[PDB]
Design an enzyme around this catalytic site. Sequence first.
Site, short mmCIF file in Angstrom:
data_model
loop_
_atom_site.label_atom_id
_atom_site.label_comp_id
_atom_site.label_asym_id
_atom_site.label_seq_id
_atom_site.Cartn_x
_atom_site.Cartn_y
_atom_site.Cartn_z
N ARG A 18 0.86 -1.19 0.00
CA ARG A 18 0.00 0.00 0.00
C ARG A 18 0.90 1.24 0.00
O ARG A 18 0.88 2.04 0.94
CB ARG A 18 -0.90 0.01 1.24
N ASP A 66 2.88 -7.91 7.29
CA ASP A 66 1.71 -7.29 6.68
C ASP A 66 0.57 -8.21 6.27
O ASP A 66 -0.09 -7.95 5.26
CB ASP A 66 2.14 -6.46 5.46
N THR A 67 0.34 -9.28 7.02
CA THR A 67 -0.76 -10.18 6.69
C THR A 67 -1.71 -10.28 7.87
O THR A 67 -2.74 -9.60 7.90
CB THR A 67 -0.26 -11.60 6.30
N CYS A 112 -1.13 -20.50 0.26
CA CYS A 112 -0.40 -20.04 1.44
C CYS A 112 0.20 -21.16 2.29
O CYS A 112 -0.49 -22.10 2.68
CB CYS A 112 -1.30 -19.18 2.32
N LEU A 113 1.50 -21.04 2.58
CA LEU A 113 2.21 -22.02 3.39
C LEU A 113 2.19 -21.65 4.87
O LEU A 113 2.50 -22.49 5.72
CB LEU A 113 3.67 -22.13 2.94
N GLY A 114 1.84 -20.41 5.18
CA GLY A 114 1.82 -19.99 6.57
C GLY A 114 0.42 -19.95 7.16
O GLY A 114 0.21 -19.39 8.23
C1 HEM Z 1 -4.25 -14.11 7.16
C2 HEM Z 1 -2.93 -14.08 6.75
C3 HEM Z 1 -2.44 -14.46 5.49
C4 HEM Z 1 -3.06 -14.40 4.26
C5 HEM Z 1 -4.49 -13.90 3.98
C6 HEM Z 1 -2.15 -14.96 3.30
C7 HEM Z 1 -2.44 -15.12 1.94
C8 HEM Z 1 -1.61 -15.68 0.98
C9 HEM Z 1 -1.90 -15.73 -0.43
C10 HEM Z 1 -3.11 -15.11 -1.10
C11 HEM Z 1 -0.84 -16.34 -1.02
C12 HEM Z 1 -0.61 -16.63 -2.50
C13 HEM Z 1 -0.33 -15.41 -3.36
C14 HEM Z 1 -0.15 -15.76 -4.82
O1 HEM Z 1 -0.68 -16.80 -5.25
O2 HEM Z 1 0.50 -14.99 -5.56
C15 HEM Z 1 0.13 -16.61 0.03
C16 HEM Z 1 1.40 -17.14 -0.17
C17 HEM Z 1 2.36 -17.36 0.82
N1 HEM Z 1 2.19 -17.10 2.15
FE1 HEM Z 1 0.50 -16.43 3.10
N2 HEM Z 1 -0.98 -15.39 3.91
C18 HEM Z 1 -1.12 -15.05 5.23
C19 HEM Z 1 -0.14 -15.23 6.19
C20 HEM Z 1 1.11 -15.78 6.00
C21 HEM Z 1 2.08 -15.98 7.04
C22 HEM Z 1 1.91 -15.56 8.49
C23 HEM Z 1 3.18 -16.58 6.47
C24 HEM Z 1 4.38 -16.95 7.09
C25 HEM Z 1 4.46 -17.48 8.36
C26 HEM Z 1 2.86 -16.73 5.06
C27 HEM Z 1 3.69 -17.28 4.09
C28 HEM Z 1 3.39 -17.46 2.75
C29 HEM Z 1 4.32 -17.98 1.76
C30 HEM Z 1 5.71 -18.57 2.02
C31 HEM Z 1 3.67 -17.89 0.58
C32 HEM Z 1 4.21 -18.20 -0.79
C33 HEM Z 1 3.97 -19.63 -1.24
C34 HEM Z 1 4.34 -19.84 -2.70
O3 HEM Z 1 4.45 -18.84 -3.43
O4 HEM Z 1 4.51 -21.00 -3.11
N3 HEM Z 1 1.56 -16.28 4.81
N4 HEM Z 1 -0.36 -16.22 1.25
C1 LIG Z 2 0.18 -11.55 -2.03
C2 LIG Z 2 0.69 -11.95 -0.65
C3 LIG Z 2 -0.33 -11.82 0.47
C4 LIG Z 2 1.37 -13.32 -0.65
C5 LIG Z 2 2.21 -13.43 0.63
C6 LIG Z 2 2.58 -11.96 1.00
C7 LIG Z 2 2.08 -11.31 -0.31
C8 LIG Z 2 1.98 -9.79 -0.16
C9 LIG Z 2 3.08 -11.69 -1.42
O1 LIG Z 2 3.99 -11.08 -1.97
C10 LIG Z 2 2.64 -13.13 -1.48
#
Ligand code: HEM
Ligand SMILES: CC1(C)[C@@H]2CC[C@@]1(C)C(=O)C2
Length: 405
Positions: free
Chosen positions: A177, A242-243, A348-350
């Site tokens: 943002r 930022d999530t 999402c892996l987290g």
């Molecule tokens: C409510 C919180 C969260 C939301 C809504 C969220 C949402 C997402 C989404 C939409 C994607 C895929 C984006 C794409 O396809 O381009 C993603 C990917 C990912 N997220 Fe989350 N996320 C959250 C929290 C987190 C947290 C806390 C971690 C780490 C502890 C995390 C780690 C990752 C990673 C490593 C990926 C990339 C996976 C890949 O590209 O193969 N996320 N997340």
């Molecule tokens: C689009 C997302 C929420 C997903 C994890 C953080 C994020 C901002 C990325 O760059 C990947």
Amino acid sequence: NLAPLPPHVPEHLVFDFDMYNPSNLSAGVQEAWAVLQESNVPDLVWTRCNGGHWIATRGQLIREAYEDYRHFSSECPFIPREAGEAYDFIPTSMDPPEQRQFRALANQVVGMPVVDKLENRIQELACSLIESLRPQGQCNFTEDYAEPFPIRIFMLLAGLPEEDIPHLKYLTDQMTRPDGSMTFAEAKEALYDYLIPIIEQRRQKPGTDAISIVANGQVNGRPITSDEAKRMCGLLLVTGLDTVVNFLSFSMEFLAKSPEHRQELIERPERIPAACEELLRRFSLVADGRILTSDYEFHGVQLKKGDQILLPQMLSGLDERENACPMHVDFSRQKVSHTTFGHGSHLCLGQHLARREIIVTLKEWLTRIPDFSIAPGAQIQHKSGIVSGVQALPLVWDPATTKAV
Ligand code: HEM
Ligand SMILES: CC1(C)[C@@H]2CC[C@@]1(C)C(=O)C2
Ligand SMILES: [K+]
């Protein structure tokens, strides 16, 4: 302004939606995006804002596109195009087959096994943070809990000093943002400026922290490179800062405005996990996308090679075709359909860590502060972007109705 309309885009599909400043933002950010789902809007539209790009407005098309990585590549996942071109985090900027090998490593530091390693600290932090606020009868939720809870957990995990949060949080927000002071490329450069030395230090003298693990990790049997490690660690910082931080505020804002829903969880706490899922659907907040690898006819629309297409993870669950009365929060909703955590090979892996932080927050907050509301006369303002959020959330409550544990 509005970028000229490409010659292959028909005029009847033009809908000038600005993902960084939607026109209906005053009614709530989710409501602002939901305008794309009105009876007069096509399933796929073109906006001349932010350089010009497509936008899938329905869960069906969003899911389909995220599943077809052959046509919709993650190489350029962000809008503006300059931000998407500069974006190079791993594994998000890669398409299968190359992407897969990095997911395994990432899972070692943000997956389920990392949730159990920090389970106790997570619990302790939530309780200490909430108890400190309890007697005050008021708080600025965004800065007093939403930010410190998820961020301190991440910094602990990554072994980074808490005093670095202000700087890192600023840079991260410029990628999701932007305030206009920094281009995505500049924010990325600064983030790497911070990480490069730390990665080198932890490769010469490994530790037990997340950065050491990734830096000294292996991908499909071979050593990860310093560059690859840097690009993966960058993503960890962004997801850490930022999530969950933003989602927690949307959830608490709703709870503060809905006494009946707070009551439901107080009398039936076993419904908290389900409520978490319904809230992740109603207050979904992410929207990134892909780039066309070739000319492709999608649902009667001609997409040209190189065209960018935003696939709002946020919209799938708000789509009435997926969930009846989508804007209504029902903790007993039968099939909670959504793509809040993504869809396809980049799921999402987290998500396990996120759900734990959310569920723990709801449980421990309602336990100590069961009755609270939005500060009198306060007008809550939201903000839109790759990840949406809440500007500020002033809450108040009668200390006499609280319970110390
Ligand atoms: C409510 C919180 C969260 C939301 C809504 C969220 C949402 C997402 C989404 C939409 C994607 C895929 C984006 C794409 O396809 O381009 C993603 C990917 C990912 N997220 Fe989350 N996320 C959250 C929290 C987190 C947290 C806390 C971690 C780490 C502890 C995390 C780690 C990752 C990673 C490593 C990926 C990339 C996976 C890949 O590209 O193969 N996320 N997340
Ligand atoms: C689009 C997302 C929420 C997903 C994890 C953080 C994020 C901002 C990325 O760059 C990947
Ligand atoms: K790129």
